From Swiss-Prot:
The organism of origin for this protein: Streptomyces azureus
Residues of the full protein shown: 56 to 72 of 72
Gene that specifies this protein: tpdA
Chain positions with (Z)-2,3-didehydrobutyrine modification: T8
Top-rank taxon: Bacteria
Name of the protein described by the UniProt record: Thiostrepton
Function: Has bacteriocidal activity. Inhibits bacterial protein biosynthesis by acting on the elongation factor Tu (EF-Tu).
Covalent link (5-amino-piperideine-2,5-dicarboxylic acid (Ser-Cys) (with S-69)) residue numbers: S5-C13
Amino acid sequence: IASASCTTXICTCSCSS
C-alpha cells in the first residue's frame, strides 16, 4: 500500500538509491 520500488500494479516500484 506504500513503498518505493516494490509492487506490480498500484503505483510505486522503484526509482532511485
